[PDB]
Amino acid sequence: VEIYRMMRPGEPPTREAAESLFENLFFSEDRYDLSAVGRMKFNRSLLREEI
C-alpha cells in the first residue's frame, strides 16, 4: 500500500493492485527481463553456485 502511494499520491490504494504495482516491477509479462546472460551476471556478482 505505501508502494502504491509512491507511484499514485492522492489516489485510493486499491487492495489487489497495491500488490501487483510492486510485484509487476520484477515479474510482469512486459516489465521485467535479464536474459540467461543477466541472470548469470546476477548470480556471478553474488558468488552463487547455482548454474
Partner: protein, 103 residues
C-alpha cells in the same frame, strides 16, 4: 517464445505459436537506391488454436486450427556486411552497456 501461446486470461481461447518466418521480397539493393525504398521483406508467423470437449468426457479434444499470419517486416543484408535503407546504407552501431542483473 516469451509471449506465445497466449492462453487467454478469459479462460475460453488460446492463440498458440510454432515459429517465425521471413520470405516474399520484391525490391533489391539497386531499386533500394534508384527508387529508394528500404531493402526489406515480411516477418510472418505460424499460429494455432485448439478447443476441448464442451459436452463429453472420453475424447479430451474437439477442435484444432493452424496457419500463418503477418507480424511485420525485416531489413536485408549483403555478403559485404551492409544494409540499404531510404536510398542509403543506414547501419546499426553495437552498444557497450552495464551487464543486466545487479551492480
Amino acid at each position: 517464445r516469451s509471449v506465445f501461446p497466449i492462453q487467454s486470461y478469459s479462460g475460453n481461447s488460446e492463440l498458440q505459436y510454432v515459429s517465425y518466418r521471413l520470405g516474399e521480397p520484391v525490391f533489391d539493393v539497386q531499386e533500394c537506391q534508384i527508387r529508394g525504398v528500404t531493402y526489406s521483406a515480411p516477418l510472418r508467423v505460424k499460429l494455432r488454436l485448439v478447443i476441448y470437449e464442451r459436452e463429453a468426457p472420453e475424447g479430451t479434444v474437439k477442435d484444432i486450427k493452424e496457419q500463418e499470419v503477418y507480424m511485420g517486416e525485416i531489413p536485408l543484408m549483403t555478403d559485404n556486411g551492409t544494409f540499404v535503407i531510404n536510398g542509403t546504407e543506414r547501419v546499426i552501431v553495437s552498444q557497450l552497456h552495464r551487464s543486466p542483473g545487479v551492480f
